[PDB]
Curated annotation (Swiss-Prot), chains A, B, C, D, E, F, G, H, I, J, K, L, M, N:
Compartments reported by the entry: Cytoplasm; Membrane; Nucleus; Synapse
Entry keywords, A to Z: Acetylation, Alzheimer disease, Amyloid, Cell projection, Copper, Cytoplasm, Disease variant, Membrane, Metal-binding, Neurodegeneration, Nucleus, Parkinson disease, Parkinsonism, Phosphoprotein, Repeat, Secreted, Synapse, Ubl conjugation
Gene: SNCA
Entry function: Neuronal protein that plays several roles in synaptic activity such as regulation of synaptic vesicle trafficking and subsequent neurotransmitter release. Participates as a monomer in synaptic vesicle exocytosis by enhancing vesicle priming, fusion and dilation of exocytotic fusion pores. Mechanistically, acts by increasing local Ca(2+) release from microdomains which is essential for the enhancement of ATP-induced exocytosis.
Protein name: Alpha-synuclein
Residues of the full protein shown: 15 to 97 of 140
Length: 72, 72, 72, 72, 72, 72, 72, 72, 72, 72, 72, 72, 72, 72
């Protein structure tokens, strides 16, 4: 669960959105008369009409994630 | 669960949004007459009509995450 | 659960939003006549019509997170 | 749960919002005739129509978080 | 669960979206009178009408993920 | 579950979307009067009308993933 | 489950989409009065009307994946 | 050009229309760089997607019309 | 041009319209750089998506019309 | 041009309209750089999405009209 | 041009309109750099999204009209 | 041009309108750099989103109209 | 131009309007750098979002009108 | 131009208006750098969001009008 990124030294990014009547639902839990529900999120949930991820890592860059589920 | 980032040294970012009648729901828990519900979030939930992530890591950069669920 | 970032030394960022009738709900817990509900948030919930994250890490930069759930 | 950031030395940031009839709800707990509800928040909940996070870490910079839930 | 990325040194990115009546649902759990449901997410769920991932890794860049499910 | 990417040194990307009446559902779990359902996601679920992944790895770049399911 | 990519040094990408009445469903689990269902995803599910993957690896680039299912 | 109707004394009418994207042009005169155009209407021009004429004459009822065109 | 109607004495009418995006143009004269145009209307021009004429004459009822065009 | 109607003595009318984005143009004269245009209306121009004429004449009832055009 | 109506003696009318974004133009004269335009109206121009004419003549009732155009 | 109506003796009318963003233009004369324009109205121009004319003549009732245009 | 109405003897009218953002323009003359414009109105111009004319003539009732235009 | 009405003898009227942001322009003359404009009104111009004319003539009732335009 360890992330490292070291950097040693010795343009135009455009997003254009023109929406009419836009409805966005992200992580949603809708229920009625239920018994048990689990929504375990540990990653990267990106939800939307204009979902843009430009130049996520440019220099030295690290990401990490870890999820689990134990019930026994 | 350890993140490190060391940097040693020896443009135009545009987002344009023009929305009419925009409704955004993020992490939502809607229920009625239920018994148990769990919404465990530990990642990165990004929800929206114009969801833009530009140049997240430019120099030395690190991210980390860790989630769990134990019931026994 | 340890984060470190050391830096040793020896543009235009535009967001434009023009919304008419914008409704945003973040972390929400709506219920009626229920028994138990848990909304454990420890990550980074970003919810909105114009959700922009520009140049999150530019120099030496570190983030961390840790969540848990034990019921026994 | 330890964060450190040391820095040794030896542009225009624009947000423009023009909203008509904007309603924002953050962390909300709405209920009626329920039994128990928990909303444990320890991360970073950012909720809003123009939610902008520009240049979060520029020099040496560290963030940390830690959440838990034990019921036994 | 370890990710590392080190970089040593010794254009126009356009997204254009013009949507009318756009509805986006991300990670959703809809149920009625059920017994148990689990939605374990630890990867990278990207959901949206204009879902663009441009130049994800440009310099030295690493990603990682790990998920599990144990019931016994 | 280890990913590494090291880089040592010694154009126009266009997406154009014009949608009328666009509906996108990502990871969805719809049920009624069921007993158990599991949706374990640990890869990379990209869902949308204009789903574009341009120049994912440009320099030194690594990705990784790992999923599991044990019931006993 | 190990991926590495090291790079040492010593055009126009167009996507054009014009859709009318576009409906996209990604990973979906629809059921009624069932007993058990599992949707284990660990690869790369890309679902959409204009699903374009241009120049996925340009420099040194590696991907990996691993899935499992044990019931005993 | 004389109409008369004398009456001496000594159910359900349903129209149901459900249209999506309906465009109706009635008496139209579209031209460019012309010399002369005449649209003489004296009858009964009924133009439309659901054009219904139910029970036009039920009791004593008379209609009449007369048109002309002289140029010499 | 004379109309008369004399009457001596000694149900449910339903129209249902449900339109989405309905455009109606009646008597229209569109031109550019023309010389002469005449639109002589003296009848009964009824133009529309749901154009219903129910029970126009029920008792004693008379209609009349007369049009002309002389240029010499 | 004479109309008379004499009457001597010795239900439910429903219109239901549910329109979204309805545009109606009646008698219109649109031109540019023209010389002469005439729109002579003397009848009954009824223009609209829900154009209903229910029970126009019920008792003794008379209508009349007369139009002309002389230029010499 | 004479109208007479004499009467000697010896239900529910419903209109329901529910419009969103309704634009109505009646008698309109739009021009640019023209020479002459005439819009002679003497009849009955009824223009609108819900144009309803219920029970126009119930007892003794008369209407009349007369238009002309002379230029010589 | 004479109208007479003599009467000798010896229910629920509902209009329901629920409009959002309604724009109505009646008799309009829009021009630029023109020479002459005439809008002669003498009839009955009724323009509007909910244009209802219920029970116009109930007892003895007469209407009349007369228009002209002479230029010589 | 003579109107007479003599009467010798020997319910619920509802209008309901609920408008949001309603703009009404009646008889309008908009121009720029023109030469001559005439708007001769002598009839009955009724312009509005909820334009209702209920029970215009109930007893003995007469209306009249007369317009002209001479230029020579 | 003579109107007479003689009468010899020997319910609930509801208007309900609930408007938000209502703008009404009646007889308007807007111009710039023009030469001549005439707005001759002699009829009955009724302009407004809730324009209701209920029970205009109930007993013996007469109306009249007369307009002219001479330029020579």
């Amino acid at each position: 669960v360890v992330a490292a990124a070291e950097k040693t030294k010795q343009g135009v990014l455009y997003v254009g959105s023109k929406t009419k009547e836009g409805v966005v639902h992200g992580v949603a839990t809708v229920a009625e008369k239920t018994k048990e529900q689990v929504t375990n999120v540990g990653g990267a949930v990106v939800t939307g009409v204009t979902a843009v991820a430009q130049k996520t890592v440019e220099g030295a860059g690290s990401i990490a994630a870890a999820t689990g589920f134990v019930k026994k």
